[PDB]
């Protein structure tokens, strides 16, 4: 018997192709689940996780914080033209809002 090599390792992914395969089966999404669908999906999950975490890691550094706080995830999402399209109807616990004052409200010169 050959030693096991995890399906993630064979795809290079950090995300777990085996669990993603189970969850596609347990969820009854369809009668059958091809061997490649968990690999493709887990790669996309790892990409979208990496996109948001780089922008949130920037926002954390911009605020001198080493840890991503929920604030930094909300800032990263709402400042991004595509994450704000993807998550445009998502509410984030302790995310807050973008600092945004309508210019007509600022004191007149």
């Amino acid at each position: 018997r050959a030693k096991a090599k995890s399906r993630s390792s064979r795809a290079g992914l950090q995300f777990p192709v085996g669990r993603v395969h189970r969850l596609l089966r347990k969820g009854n999404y369809a009668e059958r689940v091809g061997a490649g669908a968990p690999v493709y999906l887990a790669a996309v999950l790892e990409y979208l996780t990496a996109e948001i975490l780089e922008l949130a890691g920037n926002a954390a550094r911009d605020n001198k914080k080493t840890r991503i706080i929920p604030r930094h995830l909300q800032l990263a999402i709402r400042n991004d033209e595509e994450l704000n399209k993807l998550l445009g109807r998502v509410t984030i616990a302790q995310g807050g809002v973008l600092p945004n004052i309508q210019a007509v409200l600022l004191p007149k010169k």
């Binding site: 795809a11 369809a30 689940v33 979208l48 780089e54 080493t66 991503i68």
Partner: protein, 93 residues
């Protein structure tokens, strides 16, 4: 036994920002995001299979779900990184 993507989110984190950390409260949002985007792709992949009277979720379902669900440049890079992973998978085993 409750299952969380937190260990995999943290491995992605140390690739994009080796110095940077995350709070468990922010990790809960990340875990909520991964579950929500899994559910949205898998749900559209289910509908895509059903619409075509196919019993199998193939990678072609996932690819079309990602092109439906994601906007713009996210869709194109997502489709790229998935096709790469499936190729490296198939070339290995």
């Amino acid at each position: 036994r409750k299952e969380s993507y937190s260990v995999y989110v943290y491995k992605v984190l140390k690739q994009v920002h080796p110095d940077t950390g995350i709070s468990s409260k922010a990790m809960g949002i990340m875990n909520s995001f991964v579950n929500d985007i899994f559910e949205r792709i898998a749900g559209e992949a289910s509908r895509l299979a059903h619409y075509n009277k196919r019993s199998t979720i193939t990678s072609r379902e996932i690819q079309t779900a990602v092109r439906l669900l994601l906007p713009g440049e996210l869709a194109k890079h997502a489709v790229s990184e998935g096709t790469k992973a499936v190729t490296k998978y198939t070339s290995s085993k």
